[PDB]
Design an enzyme around this catalytic site. Structure first.
Site, PDB file in Angstrom:
ATOM      1  N   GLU A  56       0.757  -1.234   0.000  1.00 28.22           N
ATOM      2  CA  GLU A  56       0.000   0.000   0.000  1.00 28.22           C
ATOM      3  C   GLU A  56       0.797   1.300   0.000  1.00 28.22           C
ATOM      4  O   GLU A  56       1.748   1.456   0.774  1.00 28.22           O
ATOM      5  CB  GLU A  56      -0.940  -0.017   1.212  1.00 28.22           C
ATOM      6  CG  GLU A  56      -2.030   1.013   1.189  1.00 28.22           C
ATOM      7  CD  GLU A  56      -3.092   0.728   0.156  1.00 28.22           C
ATOM      8  OE1 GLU A  56      -3.303  -0.454  -0.194  1.00 28.22           O
ATOM      9  OE2 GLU A  56      -3.727   1.693  -0.309  1.00 28.22           O
ATOM     10  N   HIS A  62       1.185   1.935  13.043  1.00 26.94           N
ATOM     11  CA  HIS A  62       0.912   3.082  12.178  1.00 26.94           C
ATOM     12  C   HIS A  62       0.198   4.140  13.017  1.00 26.94           C
ATOM     13  O   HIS A  62      -0.908   3.909  13.523  1.00 26.94           O
ATOM     14  CB  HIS A  62       0.086   2.645  10.973  1.00 26.94           C
ATOM     15  CG  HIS A  62      -0.410   3.771  10.128  1.00 26.94           C
ATOM     16  ND1 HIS A  62       0.404   4.797   9.695  1.00 26.94           N
ATOM     17  CD2 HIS A  62      -1.629   4.005   9.590  1.00 26.94           C
ATOM     18  CE1 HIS A  62      -0.304   5.632   8.958  1.00 26.94           C
ATOM     19  NE2 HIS A  62      -1.540   5.173   8.874  1.00 26.94           N
TER      20      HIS A  62
END
Ligand SMILES: [Mg+2]
Ligand SMILES: [Mg+2]
Ligand SMILES: [Mg+2]
Ligand SMILES: [Mg+2]
Ligand SMILES: [Mg+2]
Ligand SMILES: [Mg+2]
Ligand SMILES: [Mg+2]
Ligand SMILES: [Mg+2]
Ligand SMILES: [Mg+2]
Ligand SMILES: [Mg+2]
Ligand SMILES: [Mg+2]
Ligand SMILES: [Mg+2]
Ligand SMILES: [Zn+2]
Lengths: 84, 60, 120, 83, 25, 155, 84
Positions: free
Chosen positions: A46, A83
RNA sequence: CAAGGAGGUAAAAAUGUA
RNA sequence: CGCGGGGUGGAGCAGCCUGGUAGCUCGUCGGGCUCAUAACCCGAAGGUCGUCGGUUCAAAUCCGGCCCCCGCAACCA
RNA sequence: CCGGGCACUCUAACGGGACUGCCCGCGAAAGCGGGAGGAAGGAGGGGACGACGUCUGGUCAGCAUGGCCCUUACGGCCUGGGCGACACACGUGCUACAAUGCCCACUACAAAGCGAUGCCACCCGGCAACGGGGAGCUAAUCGCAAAAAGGUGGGCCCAGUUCGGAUUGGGGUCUGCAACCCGACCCCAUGAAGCCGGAAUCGCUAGUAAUCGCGGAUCAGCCAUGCCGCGGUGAAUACG
């Protein structure tokens, strides 16, 4: 292709080294696939934008991500932890 | 993987070409002879010990 | 004398003259000569026009030769390629097809030595 | 290659699959591990997958690929050049 | 000689027989 | 080869002429140990001598050896830490072996087609004095008189 | 102080993992001191000679030598295995 | 025969792995 | 914002005057000698000649504009 | 090929046969040079044998073995791939660059070895690989093999050319359940690079180098040009 670990990425790699053993092989597996094909392979490779232009992520697990970035003959890993 | 292979070498079936002769003393797959069933190293070890009938030190 | 499209062997044995055509080697040459009935020792400098036309009629009514044989080989290689065959892709890279050694010498197929620097 | 005296195309698995499939119809995807198998003409028109060592790469069969094997159409190696 | 498949010494160096070296004394 | 004189080999004499010097040439023709062919090339060549001149083919052979046999040769020496090249006289065993070598070596350099014709013409040219090996002889002999400054390094 | 892993170095570091964790803990000790004091500290950090001029070595074991090279911003690792 | 005294020298050829 | 000179393989230089083929050394790469390195020996690759426009059949070379570097001159008062 | 002999050749076991015993010369001796003496001689030529120890040499992947580590697995089974990948570099080799050479046909001479879950004589189909038959042989009985170089006869006339065989297309045989990666052969047509090799580098002192085939191990088959042994022809040179 040479590996680049930043400050926090190496400390978090050691963080997975001290606690649970099964994730460390999965991490190295993910490094192996982004070494042979940098933007494709395992765990949804991604892209990111909207401060992270030119940086790409994969998921190590369901919450934590393995983010990275590529240049000509190098593989920079900025983090191997959560994240944000 | 040593002991399971030696007793895979003992069993006969499933496409006979899958049988490979093997030493029974040590279990070597290579340089094994059809005259004894020993490997090339177990051959020398017992032949120098004298446990091989008729085998002598060849010289000419 | 010009047989298949080529003349080129002037005084020489006729079986040698037919080996000089792409498509006829030693066996097909002796087959054509035992058909026609020509002593191969009679050279191409001294032979009857009737023997020449009989020989030409046989060798280019019987098999396929120089232009068409090359077209057939090229068509078969083009058919081996463009379909995804293993031998077709080895023809595509320009690699050998018959399971040979490429870590070492395969230079007849590969070409000249393209020496690349080699760190260490 | 093979001898001609005996029955060519050694495998039964994808054959007992495709002999149902060609007469029933409906062009399905079939995975097999039989790289040693001859493409016999009832196989023409089908999309079957062959194992290479890693995964199942699908091949498409049309009327010119017949006297071959399936391992001819499933590449095992990856070269991609030198650098 | 020795490596050529269509000659006498080539079949000798192999130990094979063919048209170019059949089996008869 | 440090201890003895590593003694000289004796050969069997010829079966058509009875001599050691011809059999040495049969051995100097010999490539891959074929003596039946090595004698055949020489014996075809002797018939070429027999019919291209009216002279006995052993008598042209002896003198063709003697016309090619060198007298002095220059050799390298190391006494005093220097590498000069010094001339010195040659032993007749080596004079024979060098002439026997030079004839077949020059005959292989001849452009003629068959082997025996090359050998025969080389004998005819060396006995009369103009072979390819007498050029090699006189060049080897030229260097010794040229380097006659160093023959005070004789032993 | 970012870490740079060469092919040989990371292949061996993947070899000290799944063979000997003692070596991995020793290498992480030496890296933790090299990241703090690059030309002093643990493992007898010596300047190198002729075929590795421009490199530095810290002792891992009696044979094994960690061969590193320093920049202003980073840290090269040419080996985490054998005696040069 | 046994042996000393004074005297011309071998070259142009460097380094060591931590 | 005057005058003169110079931008060429990785480094340092020549070729420009008088337009047709860019050469020298060190360096790089393959091999050889040595236990190994350097030295030495064999062989090979590498620039398009600051940049833009023009002349010419043809521009590193001739001309013009610009960018950069170097040297000189800036006195009377 | 028989009767028979087994005298020879071969095969095979035990023996004799050289110890410089004899002669000359040298020497105090050890020993050295030369010679009738025989096949051999002054360890006859090769093997088997290889000290105290070095390389803290190599092998935990022949096996054994101390310690550390993994056990729903660093264990175990199966299918497929891989060890065969190719811009390159090196070692060991095989085949060649030809006319002391190539090809075709005919005719000879070996040694050491191997085989009845094999060697396959000899017929038939076949251009051939090979396939059908089927005899002999528990094997100095029968088979593997006709040895190859050599000899004779014929063709090519030095031209990348009847040298050389790569690489590739097509058609087949055999093994194996199986030949796509990854087999060995046979046939057709392709028939390249190479015209004898820079700096350098290797082996060999007498049946030795060189050259030529043959057998075995492993093995269903084979990537064997390797290894291990066997015989055919057979050099040159060693001043130092
Ligand atoms: Mg097997
Ligand atoms: Mg040929
Ligand atoms: Mg090492
Ligand atoms: Mg010096
Ligand atoms: Mg120094
Ligand atoms: Mg410059
Ligand atoms: Mg003034
Ligand atoms: Mg002894
Ligand atoms: Mg070791
Ligand atoms: Mg391998
Ligand atoms: Mg391959
Ligand atoms: Mg010796
Ligand atoms: Zn054993």
């Amino acid at each position: 292709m040479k590996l680049i670990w930043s400050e926090e990425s190496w400390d978090d790699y050691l963080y997975w080294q001290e606690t649970d053993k099964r994730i460390v092989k999965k991490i190295n597996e993910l490094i192996k696939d982004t070494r042979r094909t940098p933007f494709e392979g395992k765990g949804k490779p991604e892209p990111l934008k909207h401060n992270l232009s030119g940086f790409w992520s994969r998921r190590i697990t369901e919450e934590h991500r393995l983010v990275y970035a590529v240049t000509d003959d190098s593989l920079l890993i900025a983090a191997c932890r959560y994240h944000y | 993987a040593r002991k399971a292979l030696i007793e895979k070498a003992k069993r006969t079936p499933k496409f006979k070409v899958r049988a490979y002769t093997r030493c029974v003393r040590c279990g070597r797959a290579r340089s094994v002879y059809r005259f004894f069933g020993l490997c090339r190293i177990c051959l020398r070890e017992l032949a120098h010990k004298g446990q091989l009938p008729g085998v002598r030190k060849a010289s000419w | 004398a010009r047989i298949a499209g080529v003349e080129i062997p002037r005084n020489k044995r006729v079986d040698v003259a037919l080996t000089y055509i792409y498509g006829i080697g030693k066996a097909r040459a002796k087959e054509a000569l035992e058909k026609t009935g020509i002593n191969p020792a009679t050279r191409v400098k001294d032979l009857t026009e009737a023997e020449v036309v009989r020989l030409r009629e046989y060798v280019e009514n019987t098999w396929k030769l120089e232009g068409e044989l090359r077209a057939e080989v090229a068509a078969n290689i083009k058919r081996l390629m463009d379909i995804g065959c293993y031998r077709g892709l080895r023809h595509r890279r320009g690699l050998p097809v018959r399971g040979q050694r490429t870590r070492t010498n395969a230079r007849t197929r590969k070409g000249p030595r393209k020496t690349v620097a080699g760190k260490k | 290659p093979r001898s001609l005296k005996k029955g060519v195309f050694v495998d039964d698995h994808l054959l007992e699959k495709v002999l149902e499939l060609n007469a029933k119809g409906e062009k399905r995807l079939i995975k097999t591990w039989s790289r040693r198998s001859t493409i016999v003409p009832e196989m023409v028109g089908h999309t079957i997958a062959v194992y290479n060592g890693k995964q199942h790469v699908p091949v498409y069969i049309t009327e010119n690929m017949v006297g071959h094997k399936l391992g001819e159409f499933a590449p095992t190696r990856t070269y991609r050049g030198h650098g | 000689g020795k490596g050529d498949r269509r000659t006498r010494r080539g079949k000798i160096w192999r130990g094979t027989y063919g048209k170019y070296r059949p089996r008869k004394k | 080869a440090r201890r003895r004189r590593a003694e000289v080999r004796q050969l069997q004499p010829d079966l058509v002429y009875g001599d050691v010097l011809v059999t040495a040439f049969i051995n100097k023709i010999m490539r891959d140990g074929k003596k039946n062919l090595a004698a055949r090339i020489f014996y075809d060549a002797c018939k070429i001598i027999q019919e291209k001149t009216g002279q006995e083919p052993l008598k042209v052979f002896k003198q063709a050896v003697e016309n090619v046999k060198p007298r002095m040769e220059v050799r390298s020496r190391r006494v005093g830490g220097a590498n000069y090249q010094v001339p010195m006289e040659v032993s007749p065993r080596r004079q024979q072996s060098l002439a026997l070598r030079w004839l077949v070596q020059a005959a292989n350099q001849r452009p003629e087609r068959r082997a025996a014709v090359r050998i025969a013409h080389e004998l005819m040219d060396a006995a009369e004095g103009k072979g390819g090996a007498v050029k090699k002889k006189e060049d080897v002999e030229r260097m010794a008189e040229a380097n006659r400054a160093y023959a005070h390094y004789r032993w």
